[PDB]
């Protein structure tokens, strides 16, 4: 009868989350199903990679578990694996096989071939106001979905964000990311993009993910980050300082949007009141933003980055390669048992 | 400029996470 609401919209997005959250797939590839190409990034690497039965080409994120172990980051390891096989949002990239051997976790992705933000923003200097309002919108709308489900994400950046073939984004990297009724603890991120309540040891929130929003709006807008030094503990200093300079092209409506997203007490936060993300999405600086066609990828958008073919990595820097060693014995077996 | 500052910093390449 009704046409569905966003209540309702969500509810179905956590009862398909959660029954796969409580029974994650495991083991549905292996190495050799695979070809390896090139390395795409850099516990481990990412490489380009195509399957040999369907000539699909993927994105194999490789992880040497002896690295996992050292670095002390087993759990985070395990969380990021349970939950990317478990979501399913238009703006989060797509888990299609993971797998394991005697040395490696394996986490076989959707192969986004537009390459980073990160490059383009670097090589562009700055997007401009409605060029970082699309990016931004997808951004607000996969938080919604992420913070529905208990998600915190806790590590918005540029670096990753991969930019598809429609110019829309795709967000990678969920090493940091936990599903957390309540709050949390744990010192984690890119020191340009924590909450100042991280910092301090407070325990935190969703919120933080609000905070990084407001640090990635002001660095696609002004092209550098509204915190920055040459070393991370000046950094800190600055974000726990309340203070921020804005460029004087930045509209009175991104800057107020800013002040309310870096608002360093959590409790006067955008994102963080009783509206929660309406507050946000109601904001004057998305007055022109359609959320449902955003939503829906009806939206042209900036560019669309240039595509040589499947396999072409133009849009990605070059890294130096390295084998993949897998040893006769199997490491780590009962560390990563139900990966 | 804020910008010139910025280009000139030791942070304008990819920045890793801290744990
Ligand atoms: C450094 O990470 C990447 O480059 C990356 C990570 C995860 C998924 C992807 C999909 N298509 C291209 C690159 C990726």
């Excluded at chain 2, 400029?1 to 744990?19: E, L, P």
Aim: glycine share 6%; charged share 25%; proline share 4%.
């Amino acid at each position: 009868s009704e046409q569905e609401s966003v209540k309702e919209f969500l509810a179905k997005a956590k009862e398909e989350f959660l029954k796969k959250w409580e029974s994650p797939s495991q083991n549905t590839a292996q190495l050799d199903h695979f070809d390896r190409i090139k390395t795409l990034g850099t516990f481990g690497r990412v490489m380009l990679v195509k399957h040999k039965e369907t000539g699909n080409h993927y994105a194999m994120k490789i992880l040497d578990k002896q690295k996992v172990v050292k670095l002390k980051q087993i759990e985070h390891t395990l969380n990021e694996k349970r939950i990317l096989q478990a979501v399913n949002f238009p703006f989060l990239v797509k888990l299609e096989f993971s797998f394991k051997d005697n040395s490696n976790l394996y986490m076989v992705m959707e192969y986004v071939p537009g390459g980073e933000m990160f490059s383009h923003l670097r090589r562009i200097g700055r997007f401009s106001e409605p060029h970082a309002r699309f990016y931004a919108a997808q951004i607000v709308l996969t938080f919604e979905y992420l913070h529905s489900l208990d998600l915190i994400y806790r590590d918005l950046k540029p670096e990753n964000l991969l930019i598809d073939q429609q110019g829309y984004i795709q967000v990678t990297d969920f090493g940091f990311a936990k599903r957390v009724k309540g709050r949390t603890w744990t010192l984690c991120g890119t020191p340009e993009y924590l909450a100042p309540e991280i910092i301090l040891s407070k325990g935190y929130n969703k919120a933080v993910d609000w905070w990084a929003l407001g640090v990635l709006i002001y660095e696609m807008a002004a092209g550098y980050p509204p915190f920055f030094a040459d070393q991370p503990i000046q950094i800190y200093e600055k974000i726990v300082s309340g203070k921020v300079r804005f460029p004087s092209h930045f509209s009175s409506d991104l800057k107020d949007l800013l002040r309310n997203l870096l608002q360093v007490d959590l409790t006067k936060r955008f994102g963080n009141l009783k509206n929660g993300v309406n507050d946000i999405k109601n904001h004057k600086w998305f007055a022109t933003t359609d959320w449902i066609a955003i939503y829906q990828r009806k939206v042209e958008a900036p560019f669309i980055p240039k595509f040589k073919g499947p396999g072409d990595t133009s849009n990605f820097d070059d890294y130096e390669e390295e084998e993949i060693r897998v040893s006769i014995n199997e490491k780590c077996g009962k560390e990563f048992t139900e990966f | 400029t804020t910008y010139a500052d910025f280009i000139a910093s030791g942070r304008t390449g990819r920045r890793n996470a801290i744990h």
